[PDB]
Amino acid sequence: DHKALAARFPGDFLFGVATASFQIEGATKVDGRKPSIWDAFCNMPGHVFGRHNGDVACDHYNRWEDDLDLIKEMGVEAYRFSIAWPRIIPDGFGPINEKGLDFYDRLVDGCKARGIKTYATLYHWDLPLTLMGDGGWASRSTAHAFQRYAKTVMARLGDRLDAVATFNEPWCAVWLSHLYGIHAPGERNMEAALAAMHHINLAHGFGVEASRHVAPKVPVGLVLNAHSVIPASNSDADMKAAERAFQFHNGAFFDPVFKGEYPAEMIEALGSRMPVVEAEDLSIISQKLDWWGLNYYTPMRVADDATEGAEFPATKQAPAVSDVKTDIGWEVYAPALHSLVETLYERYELPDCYITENGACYNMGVENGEVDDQPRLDYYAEHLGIVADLVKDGYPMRGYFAWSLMDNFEWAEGYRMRFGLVHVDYETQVRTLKNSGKWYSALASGFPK
Amino acid sequence: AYPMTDHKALAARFPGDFLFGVATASFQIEGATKVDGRKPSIWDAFCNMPGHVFGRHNGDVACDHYNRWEDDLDLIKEMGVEAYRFSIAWPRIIPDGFGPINEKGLDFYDRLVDGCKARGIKTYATLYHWDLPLTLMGDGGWASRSTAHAFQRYAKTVMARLGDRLDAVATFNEPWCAVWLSHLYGIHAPGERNMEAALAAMHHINLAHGFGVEASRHVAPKVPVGLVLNAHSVIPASNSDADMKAAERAFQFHNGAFFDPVFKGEYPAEMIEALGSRMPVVEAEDLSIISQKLDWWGLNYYTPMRVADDATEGAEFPATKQAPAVSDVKTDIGWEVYAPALHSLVETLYERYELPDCYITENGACYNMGVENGEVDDQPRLDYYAEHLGIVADLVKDGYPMRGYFAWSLMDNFEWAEGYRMRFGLVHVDYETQVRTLKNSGKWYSALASGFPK
């Protein structure tokens, strides 16, 4: 019931839809764009389902205007999107591609004209392939390449952008990419991952300073998939495990940014294998942010792992409690969102919070010109209920972005896992608003009240 | 009869027109990785990502050959060595792999080749010695058929500029390493561990070879064209039917994957029965392009590949396991020293395939002694050479068409995943000062080589 739900939100609550450059743009060799690490990852057998790539995607490069009109037609106030570094500074370092900047300049103008608020992400995983030559995120120079990139983007767009986030999900860009081998560039090495960790925290810091020098009026933030870690049992071992898991999976990012230090027990275990931390790094990393973005889908259930030699945090996956499952296999368990936010604000001194991603994978398509995705609607109703509870509890929840305006390239899953509020037929590129989308549109349309 | 040095007796065993040389590769020696238009290679990436290369050693400086190439040629000349085997850096010539030609890159090798000419040094150029331009990884690298066409255009470009002067050209060095070691075993760049990726690399490298032969002959029909393979000397633990069959599967996978398409115009049957379903598309003219006639071929040999049948259920083709060394004699990199395996390998290859003239394009030993009283006392390296060159002389006597020999390493250099720690040179390089010091093995090789041509 979208009307009773709406009553629970503040009149100025910000409702948005979210998207990412490589996931929707296509046009991967157009107008000066050079390859990203995800172009490489996709095209090498073994990394991405069906060897699907980003060559066409949702063809958003060519269709961005229709897509903006759709957002306006849905009555959603805000659009969260990412900027492709491979379009802006195609080799990572090197000459600026003014035609790359022109694309986003035009996009942002289109949003201004339509009253659509802009929440731009500078880095949503599409590192220019050339920078891998230096070591990619394992090299400190890559943080400096980002520093110059951030400045370049904000100099052009900073007069109009409503908000900017430096990074989306360091957890993925760091551990999932350099320790687990699941995301580009597909490494499985603790030294590599620890270097990526510190250099992405540092690049974030560089990005905050750069954006504020060239565009001091734009609210700066950082988007994190903080994990709602829940121990398998109430045993002491599982409790301590949950904490180690929290320090490694969340603390590696939250503690430097919000406390100016790394988690102590993690440094004991892993500190000797870290890159150099120069005198000024932690103070740069921990500059005050104007907001922060939480991406949430599912809890991280953990159990202690007693296996000899097991690297910190020494945990293993614990089974789901709920029996509800999205088509990508993720447990649906809404109250974990509540305990997570509760935990974070207790543990850290945080600015205003926007839910920058929330959504569900369900793969139903078009029948009778419609898409019946009731389980996605239910997912949204339930988690938005939680967000409303957090508002009532007094937490500074200022907005919410649904992950996925439309079905798109879902990283290692390719195009098989659909997250969209809008259905895309990849053969025809036809957009079809789903029932979840119609529902979300009705909710969002009445804001601001 | 009166006492004679070992090198003098050995020299008498070689024909008067025998070709002696020394060998290098571009990324291993050049340095200057970011100057004059060069863009990164997959090895720059591999080196700089922790975990892949010892000490995270990279090619940024190496032997500084890009700036010292003339000194290095004067060294060859002084050593009395007739031929120089070197590689050309694709990242210097066509820096994005595809795309615009970098004239400054071509100029470097143009000048190098003129320097060799001026000194009377024969040039044996390798077009691809593993330094694929990083940008090509974007389309899938060797897993993408397009890369074979990128190589084709690079080969054509190089040969159109240098073909009037080169004495010989090889398309590829060691497909085995660029394919399996790089895409299945994850040890060389780009560091993949995937049969599908590896099989694609296998065919596309074979295809690229053929494209290169055609391209070279199209624009430089006078240059003898070959291919350099580290063909493995496969030795079963026993002559039990099971081990003899394992040795056959090993041969097909480790050698046949390259020799059969190039020299028979087909892939080995039992390998296809096992791996065919995961191979990329083989188009109509493919095997015909791959199997063009070569003017020579290069054998890289260091150590045998001893194998036994692996009975473990589900074991992927060729389903072998390591068999014990017959000797405890090992180089500092850990490889068994067993010179007779070179005879049995050459005997095997010449009876199984119709081959052109053979040049040993790599042979050498890792021994890590440095400078003491201004000399390098590397007798085990000298011993390794005397023994293996003895085998090469045996092969000449046994009627095999061995035309020449290139000692692997003119000097110490970047040894891939081993970094600078593993030294193969006839000449020592102090990486702090860049000073070159001819080792005792180098003096011995110079003495042998200087007498040729007789």
Side-chain angles (χ1 to χ4, degrees):
Chain A
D1 182 74
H2 81 73
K3 94 155 99 76
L5 179 57
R8 313 192 50 207
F9 289 98
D12 69 344
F13 198 71
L14 189 64
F15 283 101
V17 293
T19 233
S21 61
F22 192 71
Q23 293 186 264
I24 69 170
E25 291 182 0
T28 55
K29 303 203 179 64
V30 171
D31 290 337
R33 182 188 181 277
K34 282 189 196 297
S36 82
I37 57 177
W38 269 93
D39 295 271
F41 199 60
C42 286
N43 289 332
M44 178 65 67
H47 295 306
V48 170
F49 174 79
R51 297 180 206 172
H52 295 175
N53 61 28
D55 283 13
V56 178
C58 306
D59 196 37
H60 176 76
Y61 192 80
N62 295 117
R63 297 167 187 265
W64 61 273
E65 54 287 328
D66 296 334
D67 291 340
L68 290 192
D69 283 328
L70 171 59
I71 295 177
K72 202 210 148 220
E73 177 66 43
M74 294 171 57
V76 172
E77 196 182 349
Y79 178 42
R80 162 160 194 258
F81 60 98
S82 82
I83 310 293
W85 191 352
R87 298 202 188 273
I88 306 307
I89 314 180
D91 273 324
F93 280 113
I96 312 308
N97 182 20
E98 294 298 328
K99 289 216 288 190
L101 281 169
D102 290 347
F103 172 68
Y104 302 97
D105 211 355
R106 211 193 330 170
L107 182 81
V108 168
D109 270 3
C111 288
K112 280 296 285 194
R114 291 164 174 84
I116 294 167
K117 308 243 165 307
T118 49
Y119 274 63
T121 308
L122 297 183
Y123 185 85
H124 210 303
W125 310 345
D126 47 343
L127 185 80
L129 174 62
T130 300
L131 294 173
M132 295 306 296
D134 297 328
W137 285 114
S139 184
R140 186 178 177 95
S141 59
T142 303
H144 282 290
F146 180 78
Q147 179 190 42
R148 177 173 174 260
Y149 162 63
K151 163 202 82 184
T152 306
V153 171
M154 293 307 296
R156 181 74 87 83
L157 304 183
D159 62 319
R160 285 154 299 148
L161 284 176
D162 297 290
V164 64
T166 54
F167 285 79
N168 175 84
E169 300 183 340
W171 184 91
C172 289
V174 177
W175 306 128
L176 197 57
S177 289
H178 297 86
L179 190 65
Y180 305 144
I182 302 303
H183 277 186
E187 292 285 347
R188 299 167 228 257
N189 180 277
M190 184 62 78
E191 274 173 38
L194 286 171
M197 173 195 71
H198 185 61
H199 296 151
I200 284 182
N201 285 341
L202 183 67
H204 157 76
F206 285 169
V208 177
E209 174 161 357
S211 177
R212 275 176 186 158
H213 282 335
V214 299
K217 301 306 238 61
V218 181
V220 185
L222 175 59
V223 171
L224 300 129
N225 54 338
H227 299 278
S228 189
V229 184
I230 304 166
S233 76
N234 293 314
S235 75
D236 246 81
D238 283 353
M239 174 181 84
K240 293 181 166 41
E243 169 61 22
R244 299 194 302 274
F246 190 99
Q247 291 190 351
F248 188 83
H249 296 285
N250 296 336
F253 315 114
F254 278 85
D255 289 75
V257 173
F258 300 108
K259 295 155 96 93
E261 60 185 5
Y262 279 96
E265 287 69 35
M266 175 183 170
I267 287 294
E268 276 174 357
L270 303 177
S272 74
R273 292 181 273 173
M274 275 181 65
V276 187
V277 177
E278 295 287 346
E280 309 82 358
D281 292 357
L282 281 178
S283 83
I284 293 175
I285 294 165
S286 60
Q287 292 169 72
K288 255 60 175 195
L289 302 182
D290 301 302
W291 62 282
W292 79 279
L294 173 61
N295 290 359
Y296 176 83
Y297 297 90
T298 195
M300 170 176 285
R301 307 191 172 280
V302 299
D304 175 41
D305 178 29
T307 311
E308 176 72 16
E311 193 57 85
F312 185 93
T315 63
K316 53 176 187 278
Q317 161 102 249
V321 173
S322 164
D323 295 283
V324 198
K325 211 178 290 299
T326 69
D327 289 346
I328 200 175
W330 298 348
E331 181 190 2
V332 179
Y333 189 72
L337 173 50
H338 190 288
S339 43
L340 173 58
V341 172
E342 176 180 67
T343 299
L344 293 173
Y345 277 96
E346 176 67 23
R347 194 181 180 117
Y348 304 104
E349 291 296 318
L350 302 163
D352 283 352
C353 177
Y354 295 76
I355 298 307
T356 41
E357 292 191 10
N358 179 239
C361 177
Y362 287 106
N363 297 327
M364 52 277 296
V366 178
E367 271 208 51
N368 308 119
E370 308 173 62
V371 178
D372 181 17
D373 56 337
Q374 191 68 38
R376 180 151 36 226
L377 203 160
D378 296 345
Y379 182 103
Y380 278 114
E382 185 169 19
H383 290 82
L384 281 166
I386 304 297
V387 178
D389 298 335
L390 293 165
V391 173
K392 189 56 184 160
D393 292 2
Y395 294 101
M397 314 290 113
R398 307 287 186 232
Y400 176 98
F401 295 78
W403 179 265
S404 247
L405 158 57
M406 64 187 156
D407 302 326
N408 57 45
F409 174 76
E410 179 51 30
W411 306 116
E413 302 282 355
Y415 296 97
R416 187 166 70 164
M417 297 294 104
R418 299 178 181 268
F419 272 90
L421 289 176
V422 171
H423 180 272
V424 184
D425 183 305
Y426 295 117
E427 298 169 29
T428 67
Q429 294 293 334
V430 169
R431 277 76 161 129
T432 303
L433 190 61
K434 301 176 183 176
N435 292 358
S436 49
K438 296 175 176 182
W439 178 90
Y440 188 74
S441 163
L443 172 62
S445 282
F447 293 80
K449 290 175 179 178
Chain B
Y2 293 134
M4 304 231 313
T5 60
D6 51 6
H7 57 78
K8 171 168 168 158
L10 180 61
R13 306 195 57 218
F14 290 85
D17 66 346
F18 198 84
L19 187 72
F20 284 104
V22 294
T24 57
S26 52
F27 190 80
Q28 303 188 253
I29 69 172
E30 279 177 12
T33 54
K34 297 199 170 200
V35 305
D36 294 343
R38 188 185 177 278
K39 280 182 188 268
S41 76
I42 61 176
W43 271 92
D44 295 271
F46 199 61
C47 282
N48 287 326
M49 178 66 68
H52 294 306
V53 177
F54 177 82
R56 289 167 211 182
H57 290 175
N58 68 29
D60 286 358
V61 174
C63 306
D64 197 34
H65 173 88
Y66 187 83
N67 290 302
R68 310 164 97 95
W69 64 271
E70 292 165 280
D71 289 346
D72 288 340
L73 296 186
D74 291 336
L75 176 49
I76 306 301
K77 177 62 159 187
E78 291 162 4
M79 282 172 71
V81 167
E82 184 176 8
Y84 176 44
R85 174 163 183 255
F86 64 97
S87 88
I88 302 181
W90 189 352
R92 294 197 195 280
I93 308 302
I94 318 190
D96 279 313
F98 275 114
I101 303 313
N102 174 30
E103 164 70 0
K104 292 185 184 197
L106 275 176
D107 292 343
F108 172 71
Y109 297 100
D110 207 346
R111 286 166 17 231
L112 177 77
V113 172
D114 283 340
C116 288
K117 289 295 288 196
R119 290 160 174 81
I121 296 169
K122 301 310 209 305
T123 47
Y124 274 61
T126 305
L127 297 178
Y128 183 85
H129 202 133
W130 306 352
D131 48 341
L132 185 73
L134 180 61
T135 298
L136 294 176
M137 287 313 290
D139 312 295
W142 283 119
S144 166
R145 185 185 177 93
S146 55
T147 299
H149 284 291
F151 172 76
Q152 170 184 52
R153 170 171 180 265
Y154 155 66
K156 200 168 183 172
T157 297
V158 179
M159 300 301 301
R161 169 73 73 92
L162 305 181
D164 57 322
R165 293 167 310 260
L166 289 169
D167 298 289
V169 66
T171 54
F172 284 80
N173 178 80
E174 299 188 347
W176 188 91
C177 288
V179 174
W180 307 129
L181 199 59
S182 304
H183 294 96
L184 183 70
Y185 306 138
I187 300 294
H188 280 186
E192 289 289 348
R193 295 175 163 91
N194 182 271
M195 185 60 75
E196 213 169 288
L199 289 167
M202 174 194 66
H203 185 67
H204 295 148
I205 282 180
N206 286 333
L207 183 66
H209 160 68
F211 283 166
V213 177
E214 287 192 10
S216 175
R217 285 182 180 146
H218 189 97
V219 305
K222 288 166 34 224
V223 185
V225 180
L227 172 58
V228 173
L229 304 124
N230 54 333
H232 305 264
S233 197
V234 180
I235 309 174
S238 65
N239 292 118
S240 86
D241 192 72
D243 280 342
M244 292 202 301
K245 285 189 315 139
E248 175 58 22
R249 302 192 299 272
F251 192 99
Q252 295 192 10
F253 184 82
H254 294 286
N255 299 332
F258 316 109
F259 275 87
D260 281 83
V262 169
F263 298 108
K264 291 179 172 179
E266 63 189 27
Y267 280 92
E270 289 73 26
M271 182 181 158
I272 294 295
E273 179 185 7
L275 299 175
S277 81
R278 293 174 277 172
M279 268 183 67
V281 159
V282 180
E283 303 283 9
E285 307 213 28
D286 279 12
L287 288 168
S288 161
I289 291 166
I290 293 174
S291 62
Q292 283 167 83
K293 266 306 145 339
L294 298 184
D295 298 307
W296 63 278
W297 75 284
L299 173 56
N300 291 359
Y301 173 84
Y302 296 91
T303 191
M305 180 188 177
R306 299 193 180 275
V307 303
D309 199 306
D310 182 17
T312 320
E313 281 298 302
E316 184 59 282
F317 187 95
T320 62
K321 61 167 167 173
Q322 182 67 60
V326 183
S327 163
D328 300 348
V329 180
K330 291 165 192 315
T331 66
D332 285 349
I333 199 166
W335 303 346
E336 179 190 8
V337 179
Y338 187 77
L342 173 60
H343 165 87
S344 58
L345 175 60
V346 172
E347 183 179 3
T348 300
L349 291 175
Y350 272 89
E351 98 90 36
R352 192 198 268 237
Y353 304 99
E354 183 169 359
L355 301 166
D357 284 353
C358 176
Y359 291 78
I360 302 299
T361 40
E362 286 186 26
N363 183 235
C366 176
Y367 285 110
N368 293 333
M369 52 278 298
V371 181
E372 301 175 79
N373 324 147
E375 305 285 349
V376 182
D377 296 316
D378 63 341
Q379 189 70 41
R381 177 176 289 106
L382 193 168
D383 289 346
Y384 180 102
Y385 280 107
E387 191 176 10
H388 285 77
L389 275 166
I391 298 305
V392 173
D394 287 347
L395 292 167
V396 167
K397 171 188 99 173
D398 290 350
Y400 300 100
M402 318 289 94
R403 308 265 93 92
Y405 176 98
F406 291 79
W408 176 274
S409 231
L410 167 51
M411 67 193 164
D412 299 333
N413 59 47
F414 174 78
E415 184 44 35
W416 308 111
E418 305 278 0
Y420 298 97
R421 185 172 58 177
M422 298 289 169
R423 302 179 176 272
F424 276 87
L426 292 174
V427 175
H428 178 274
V429 181
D430 189 302
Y431 295 117
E432 180 182 25
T433 62
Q434 293 295 342
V435 166
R436 278 80 157 125
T437 302
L438 186 59
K439 308 179 185 178
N440 286 1
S441 64
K443 298 187 214 121
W444 180 95
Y445 188 72
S446 174
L448 169 59
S450 280
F452 293 80
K454 301 167 164 179

